[PDB]
A paper describes a structure:
[name] is an auto-inhibited ubiquitin E3 ligase activated by dual phosphorylation of its ubiquitin-like ([name]) domain and ubiquitin by the PINK1 kinase. [name] is an autoinhibited RBR family E3 ubiquitin ligase consisting of an N-terminal ubiquitin-like ([name]) domain followed by four Zn2+ binding domains [name], RING1, in-between-RING (IBR), and RING2. Like other RBR-family E3 ligases, [name] binds to an E2, and ubiquitin is transferred from E2 onto the catalytic C431 residue (on RING2) of [name] before ubiquitination of lysines on target substrates. Furthermore, C431 on RING2 is occluded by the [name] domain of [name], which inhibits [name] activity.
Numbering used by the authors: 141 to 353, 359 to 377, 393 to 465
The structure:
């Protein structure tokens, strides 16, 4: 791949986050025969059903709605082996610094707070890890447990919870226990301190001794050891790590010459498919690759955020 606009979670054989491939099909016949009037320009175009229309080229099909889906890109996949789109994840093509480590990384996660704060995938991992260990996830009835923007911005809870698959199998599994553990705690119960167990227990609240009967561990609850009979975000960083913030000038400009005629072209939205405005040229080309348009570019970066 020359360029990846998308990333998915590949349940296997990657069991990890990977660059994904975009696909489209008639939502009536489910064939690869919908021509779109207009290509996608943003995540909504591909995530909201029937938002995008074409003509299904099957002789005897009348469907005009598109249905988009994604696939892992790290290897072959069957015509429809679907991966979940991690739509918060973006290639950092404008070299924006991260809100927490302040390095330039790629890809990044972009919170859907108003400020559209940017965090690298390393810091997102750690953010998630920290917030587990410290029971700092946030509940929401219609979601369960999630995390907001790292900067503390409201209405910024991650809704597509497959974004936590960024934690690797085990951290991820901790994450899935979290509600269940929280239940016990919220009833004055306790978790087994034994590493690898962490099972839920509810003794009488005025007992300092607690036995896991799990893995057998007796422990003192006040201090979580085995049972003794004795006694026991920077402000500038935030401002800078904003998706839509005004930036310097990179290598990759915001005016580029048509590959055929060489007239400078402005790009006026998210779709990577360009059509040269010149009446006497009209080349269709990819904004990024500088080449005639094609199904690879469609697959890999039909649009960019
Ligand atoms: Ba002692
Ligand atoms: Zn894969
Ligand atoms: Zn059809
Ligand atoms: Zn970072
Ligand atoms: Zn934010
Ligand atoms: Zn235990
Ligand atoms: Zn103790
Ligand atoms: Zn041209
Ligand atoms: Zn391209």
């Amino acid at each position: 791949s020359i360029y990846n606009s998308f990333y998915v979670y590949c349940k296997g054989p990657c069991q990890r986050v990977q660059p994904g491939k975009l696909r489209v099909q008639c939502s009536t016949c489910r064939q690869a025969t919908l021509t779109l009037t207009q290509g996608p320009s943003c995540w909504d175009d591909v995530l909201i059903p029937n938002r995008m229309s074409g003509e299904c080229q099957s002789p005897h099909c009348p469907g005009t709605s598109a249905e988009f889906f994604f696939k892992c890109g790290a290897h072959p996949t069957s015509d429809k082996e679907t991966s979940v789109a991690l739509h918060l994840i973006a290639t950092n093509s404008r070299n924006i610094t991260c809100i927490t480590c302040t390095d330039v990384r790629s890809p990044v996660l972009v919170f859907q707070c108003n400020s559209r704060h940017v965090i690298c995938l390393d810091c997102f991992h750690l953010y998630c890890v920290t917030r587990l260990n410290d029971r700092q996830f946030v509940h929401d009835p219609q979601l369960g447990y999630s995390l907001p923007c790292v900067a503390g911005c409201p209405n910024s809870l991650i809704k597509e919870l497959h974004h936590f698959r960024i934690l690797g199998e085990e951290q991820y599994n901790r994450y899935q226990q979290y509600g269940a553990e929280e239940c016990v705690l919220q009833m004055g119960g306790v978790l087994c301190p034994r590493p690898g167990c962490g099972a839920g227990l509810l003794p009488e609240p005025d007992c300092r001794k607690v036995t896991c009967e799990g893995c057998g561990f007796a422990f003192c609850r006040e201090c979580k050891e085995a049972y003794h009979e004795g006694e026991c975000v920077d402000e500038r960083a935030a401002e800078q790590a904003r998706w839509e913030a005004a930036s310097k000038e990179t290598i990759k400009k915001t005016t580029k010459p048509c590959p055929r005629c060489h007239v400078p072209v402005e790009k006026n939205g998210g779709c990577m498919h360009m059509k040269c405005p010149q009446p006497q040229c009209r080349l269709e080309w990819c904004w990024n690759c500088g080449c005639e348009w094609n199904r690879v570019c469609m697959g890999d970066h039909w649009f960019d955020v």
